[PDB]
Amino acid sequence: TYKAPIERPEDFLKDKEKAKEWERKEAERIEQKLERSEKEALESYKKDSVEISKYSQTRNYFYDYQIEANSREKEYKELRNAISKNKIDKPMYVYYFESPEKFAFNKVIRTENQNEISLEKFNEFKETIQNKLFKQDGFKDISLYEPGKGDEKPTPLLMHLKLPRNTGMLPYTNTNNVSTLIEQGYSIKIDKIVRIVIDGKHYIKAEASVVSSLDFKDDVSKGDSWGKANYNDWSNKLTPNELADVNDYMRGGYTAINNYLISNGPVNNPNPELDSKITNIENALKREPIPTNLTVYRRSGPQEFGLTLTSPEYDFNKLENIDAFKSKWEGQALSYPNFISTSIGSVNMSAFAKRKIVLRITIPKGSPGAYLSAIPGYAGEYEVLLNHGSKFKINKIDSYKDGTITKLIVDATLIP
Numbered sequence: 001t002y003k004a005p006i007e008r009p010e011d012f013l014k015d016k017e018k019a020k021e022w023e024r025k026e027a028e029r030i031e032q033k034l035e036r037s038e039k040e041a042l043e044s045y046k047k048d049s050v051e052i053s054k055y056s057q058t059r060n061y062f063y064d065y066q067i068e069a070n071s072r073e074k075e076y077k078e079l080r081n082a083i084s085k086n087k088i089d090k091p092m093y094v095y096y097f098e099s100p101e102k103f104a105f106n107k108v109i110r111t112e113n114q115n116e117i118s119l120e121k122f123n124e125f126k127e128t129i130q131n132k133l134f135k136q137d138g139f140k141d142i143s144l145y146e147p148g149k150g151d152e153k154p155t156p157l158l159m160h161l162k163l164p165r166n167t168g169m170l171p172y173t174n175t176n177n178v179s180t181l182i183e184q185g186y187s188i189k190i191d192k193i194v195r196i197v198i199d200g201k202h203y204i205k206a207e208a209s210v211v212s213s214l215d216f217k218d219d220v221s222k223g224d225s226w227g228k229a230n231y232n233d234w235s236n237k238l239t240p241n242e243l244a245d246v247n248d249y250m251r252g253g254y255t256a257i258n259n260y261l262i263s264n265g266p267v268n269n270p271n272p273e274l275d276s277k278i279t280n281i282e283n284a285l286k287r288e289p290i291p292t293n294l295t296v297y298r299r300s301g302p303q304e305f306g307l308t309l310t311s312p313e314y315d316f317n318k319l320e321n322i323d324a325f326k327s328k329w330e331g332q333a334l335s336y337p338n339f340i341s342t343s344i345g346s347v348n349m350s351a352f353a354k355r356k357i358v359l360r361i362t363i364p365k366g367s368p369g370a371y372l373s374a375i376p377g378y379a380g381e382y383e384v385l386l387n388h389g390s391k392f393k394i395n396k397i398d399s400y401k402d403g404t405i406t407k408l409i410v411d412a413t414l415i416p
């Protein structure tokens with residue numbers, strides 16, 4: 001056991017005084033560890049906060065060069081670095097109010113003036129969040145204690161999140177107040193909800209935990225090293241026939257295979273040669289299953305979501321189109337008859353420059369898949385191939401501006 005510089009429990013619970021006392025001592029202690037550029041980034045954060053956090057949520061979806069050249073990138077890196085100066089030595093339970101719309105719950109739990117949360121609403125919220133992972137991203141201020149009477153309580157939903165060991169946490173002073181900054185960047189699972197009473201009103205307290213995953217975001221180099229560490233020896237694990245079919249697929253055979261699968265060819269017009277290729281590629285993907293929870297990115301064309309390039313509903317620059325898209329797909333399963341190519345990185349690429357839908361997939365540990373880019377003779381980069389017939393549960397949809405074009409981030413989970 002590491003003896004921490006300033007002792008604390010994992011959860012301060014309702015003890016505001018003890019949490020605030022510890023938070024102030026920590027803010028002072030970490031300030032002493034911060035570089036000049038990091039302290040300066042923290043000063044800029046106190047004066048912007050909203051724009052700096054918004055930037056941190058979608059910065060990784062642009063081209064690698066657009067990221068570097070962005071005017072907010074240096075401040076993002078300095079503030080990110082400041083938070084990583086305090087990776088916690090043991091878990092910490094945190095608290096924050098959240099909008100139920102964050103979990104795609106679009107009904108009202110209760111109004112600000114209503115005191116009660118009906119069992120009807122409570123159970124409807126439970127059904128929306130149960131058995132789902134939700135990606136949380138960007139800079140966020142959180143509390144170290146359960147809010148009470150004399151605390152701001154802006155929504156009927158209170159998150160009680162266990163932050164694991166080594167999560168960066170930045171306690172900092174802001175004039176006469178103290179707060180804690182985190183950068184998020186994980187999947188959460190809401191294990192349990194309970195109706196609690198704070199000052200004569202019902203609130204839903206959501207017991208959430210971080211479900212760890214690898215998510216390289218724009219760091220394609222780190223993603224590539226991971227893929228190569230786990231799949232450099234993959235082609236040698238295959239039979240010569242499995243490898244020849246994987247290579248044939250990668251070398252442009254994907255068109256005949258994926259069109260055959262999409263058109264339901266194995267049922268309406270069976271092709272034994274193509275069926276054998278599908279069987280071998282599928283078996284190859286089951287040889288070395290994804291070893292850990294892994295987040296991948298796919299730049300999707302409109303056809304994957306029943307649209308075309310000229311469809312008016314594909315104009316996400318109109319709010320009614322984002323609303324119609326979210327209503328149709330959030331909480332739904334998306335099935336792919338074809339093999340699905342994805343990247344370990346979220347960056348935009350010339351090949352997919354204009355695609356407006358970013359499918360952000362969490363692959364559970366043990367799923368079929370392979371890092372195809374670890375193959376020697378293959379040119380294709382950062383590629384994880386997923387098995388044909390994969391179904392993806394869409395948890396949440398978000399929008400972002402890519403210049404003048406609104407694009408969507410579809411947060412989905414590969415379902416077994």
Ligand SMILES: Nc1ncnc2c(CN3C[C@H](CSc4ccc(Cl)cc4)[C@@H](O)C3)c[nH]c12
Nearest residue numbers: 297298299341342343349351380381382383
């Ligand atoms: N719809 C899709 N979305 C995202 N990624 C993929 C991929 C995976 N790779 C992206 C990549 C696009 S072109 C390219 C080449 C070199 C470099 Cl250094 C960066 C980009 C291909 O090599 C395969 C296939 N289909 C995808």
